[PDB]
Amino acid sequence: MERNKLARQIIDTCLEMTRLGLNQGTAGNVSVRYQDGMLITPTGIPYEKLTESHIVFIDGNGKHEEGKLPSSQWRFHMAAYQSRPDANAVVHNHAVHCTAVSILNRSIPAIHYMIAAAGGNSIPCAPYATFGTRELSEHVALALKNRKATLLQHHGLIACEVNLEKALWLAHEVEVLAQLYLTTLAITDPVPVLSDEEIAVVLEKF
Amino acid sequence: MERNKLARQIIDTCLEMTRLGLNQGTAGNVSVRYQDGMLITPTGIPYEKLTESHIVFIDGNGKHEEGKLPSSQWRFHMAAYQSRPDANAVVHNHAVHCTAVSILNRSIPAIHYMIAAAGGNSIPCAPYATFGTRELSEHVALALKNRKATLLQHHGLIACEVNLEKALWLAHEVEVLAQLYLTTLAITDPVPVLSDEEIAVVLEKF
Amino acid sequence: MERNKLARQIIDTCLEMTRLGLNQGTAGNVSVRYQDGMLITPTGIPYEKLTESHIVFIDGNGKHEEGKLPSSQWRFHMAAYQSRPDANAVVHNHAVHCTAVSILNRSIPAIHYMIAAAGGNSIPCAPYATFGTRELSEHVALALKNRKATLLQHHGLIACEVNLEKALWLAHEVEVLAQLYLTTLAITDPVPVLSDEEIAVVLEKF
Amino acid sequence: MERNKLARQIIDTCLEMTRLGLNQGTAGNVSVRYQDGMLITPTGIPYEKLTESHIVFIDGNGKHEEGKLPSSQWRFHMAAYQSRPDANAVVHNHAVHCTAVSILNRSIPAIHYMIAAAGGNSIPCAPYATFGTRELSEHVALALKNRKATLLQHHGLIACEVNLEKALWLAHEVEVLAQLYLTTLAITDPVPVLSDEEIAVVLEKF
Ligand SMILES: [Zn+2]
Ligand SMILES: [Zn+2]
Ligand SMILES: [Zn+2]
Ligand SMILES: [Zn+2]
Description:
The structure is a homotetramer.
Chain A: H1 3-19, E1 29-34, E2 37-40, E3 56-58, H2 74-83, E4 89-93, H3 96-104, E5 125-126, H4 134-143, E6 149-152, E7 156-161, H5 164-185, H6 196-205
Parallel strand pairs in A: 5-6
Antiparallel strand pairs in A: 1-2, 1-4, 2-3, 4-7, 6-7
Helix pairs in contact in A: 1-5, 2-4, 3-5
The structure holds zinc ion (4 copies).
């Protein structure tokens, strides 16, 4: 749990994200909680050229390491960390099904019991704000108060968890739920969902 | 047909399942009939870290090997084995098209002649029950009385056959039929199907 | 252009077909014109275990080599060869989009100028008949009189050309046209098409 | 920035295009600005057999190197270069989602903020004309006056940028926007879009 070990795992997560077909447009950024701030992917540099020394450290004040440019979305990574003290890793991407649901400005309801992996009976959709602004950060902070993942309207997805492996797994599961939702919504609306009682049982079971 | 040979084939089936794009969310579990019970994948451990000694033996009583945790869905694997004496292998996954049809709570009708590979003119959909419960097991046992594969409402798919190779092949074919069904259902409802007479001819031919 | 060279190319075409995502369910079969009949893939044997000596020779009478089982669909390969003297290779598969259009029992109209690669302004759909019957063969023979590719209702696709490389390429293009057609049909029906005049110009240009 | 270095990058872009799933039907062609004209992919030769010496030089007059056949679509590559002096590379393909939107004859509106990567609030659709004609070239030239990418009705996509890496990236992003658009259009029409004000802010921000 030295910086370089953590930097490699961020890079592995970027590669795995592309392998899984979640990083379309090379839009993602990945971060981990570190010291008083976080380690995050840099802006510009394509994922396949990424090396350990490219990873940027941003402190609690928002001051980033000299000579390195953090992702343009670093601020809502910091907002997730402040809003969810238990989160140690954050994954952001523009997975197509998630982003399509975020264009409809819909929450994903409990169409499958795995919806409870994000903490409740839904995956919310935070209202649009211009990328990189404080206003976007506030909407994300509010949406993550009681959920580990959120859609961002007209934009994409943020998922947070205790480590990169779970954060990536969660992100992937939300993309499956989004695809399931869009496929059934094209047939019938509304889509059959599981009741709050049933989801309370599953949550207790998890 | 020693335990280790069977354990390797289970692991190969998990890998092949992911290769085929049926194991989305890393939700599957695979088992084979063995001695008085079965060998099944363990809970927790990601598929790529899976080794022969991770595979768990569960006897006829439901007692599992000391120090190993069987999949959380072991019970409906045991229900399939008791309901279908001819089954020697069972594959479960959350393939997206199958799961989407299971959310509509629909059976897949005879939209293609390959529907007869599961034993009749349809692929049923068993009613939802909380994962891991006896009630889920009963619905699965009933649905598999005269079919080798079934959807599970709000959940996924179970397919069983005489060996892992056929069980995987069947699972894959049901996922193709599910995709075919959802694609045509978005255009027209109902979907044209083949008649019972035609399917009786194909069954006789198989 | 010895038998073994031709047998390798058939096997390569099976692999390439799977690479392209056209061979879903391991449903395809591939043949080439040879001597007085054809060389075709065998029934049963999965594609990845396929070796040169597995390829079966079937003569003009329909008598196949001793000790080898030709694909269960050999008859409509022979029907294509008799109907289209210019065809030297035939590819059959159950590509999902093609098969979904074949379930609607629709012809694919001229939604794109590449429709002319199959010889006219459409890709027809031959009426269903039980697999392996003479009746299926007659429908295929009629549909291929003035087209190099046809859908088969409730079944899949047949594409024929001057060599395996073009036959595979054609099969792939029809699968793209099928996907294009289904995607736009879910939005609007009918789908805008190019006129007969325009297609006559493109045909002249090819 | 010798010819051979540029020829390798064209070939790498063809391979990458196929990797990304944008080159379906082996329909693409790629060019770069060079000397008084351009280097472009040849007609006929499949991408995987492509070697540096296959790449064709076409001058400003349209005269191509002796003994080599340029892509059949070279003319609208030349039209892009004359219309957009800043473009140094041009990518053309028949990506399925783009082509499906081009069959509807629709422009893609601002359903996502990444729409501004092509220069405005939309991705236009140029009216159909027979491939390889001067009339097709004029429509492309007009559509690219204030956009870096355009759909071509009943045909596919053209994307242009300052280098091959950005041109490919742009092409890929337009394919994601096309898929997003088609997925949401099947659910609701019209699709929610971002306002002109919002897009002006994002453009200023880029
Ligand atoms: Zn983003
Ligand atoms: Zn399950
Ligand atoms: Zn077939
Ligand atoms: Zn083209």
